[PDB]
Amino acid sequence: SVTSDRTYYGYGDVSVKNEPVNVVVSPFSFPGANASLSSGGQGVFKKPD
Amino acid sequence: QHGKAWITLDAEELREGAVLGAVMYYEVKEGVLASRLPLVFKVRVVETG
Ligand SMILES: [Ca+2]
Ligand SMILES: [Ca+2]
Ligand SMILES: [Ca+2]
Ligand SMILES: [Ca+2]
């Protein structure tokens, strides 16, 4: 007696939470400790991490 | 007459303590009598590294 509207459903959800990367900074204080940078000087400074 | 010097020190001479003495050869003009005459030399650091 009923004319069914033939439509059933399925569903799902997608969760995009974080950003791809975290650029953790540990800044450099390049004259350093137990060192010295003078005017006109020339050299190299290294920070591994 | 020749008024400029260009003394340059490198990694071995600095790393031992650089002393610059003076040796003066002089002849006083005939009959001149003075007291406490000044002698002034300008030290320019032109290029360091
Ligand atoms: Ca993040
Ligand atoms: Ca320089
Ligand atoms: Ca240097
Ligand atoms: Ca030398």
Quickly list DSSP for chain A: -----------------S-S---------TT-SS----TT---------
Tokens of B29: 């003009």
Residue B38: DSSP 8-state? -
**Ligand 2: distance of its center to the CA of A28 in Å?**
23
The distance of B49 to chain A (nearest Cα, Å) reads: 4
Q: What is the amino acid identity at position A11? A: Y
Query: By the CB < 8 Å criterion, does A40 face chain B?
Result: yes
Closest CA to A42 of B30, B48, B27, B39: B48
Say whether B11 sits in a helix, a strand or coil.
helix
Task: Decide if A39 contacts B46 (C-beta within 8 A).
Answer: no
Phi-psi region of A38 (alpha: psi -120 to 50; beta: other; left: phi over 0): beta
- Beta-carbon contacts of A28 under 8 Å, excluding residues fewer than 6 positions away, are A45, A47
B10-35: burial string, b at 16+ Cβ within 10 Å, e else: eeeeeeeeeeeeeeeeeeeeeeeeee
Method of determination is: cryo-EM
Tell me which chain A residue has its CA closest to the CA of residue B47: A40
Place of tokens 């004319």: A3
Please tell me the distance from the alpha carbon of residue A9 to that of residue B24, in angstroms, as a whole number.
107
Resolution in A: 3.4
Do B45 and A40 count as a contact with CB atoms less than 8 A apart? Answer: yes
**How far is the first Cα of chain A from the last one, in angstroms, to the nearest whole number?**
76
Tell me which chain A residue has its CA closest to the CA of residue B45: A40
Please tell me the distance from the alpha carbon of residue B1 to that of residue B15, in angstroms, as a whole number.
33
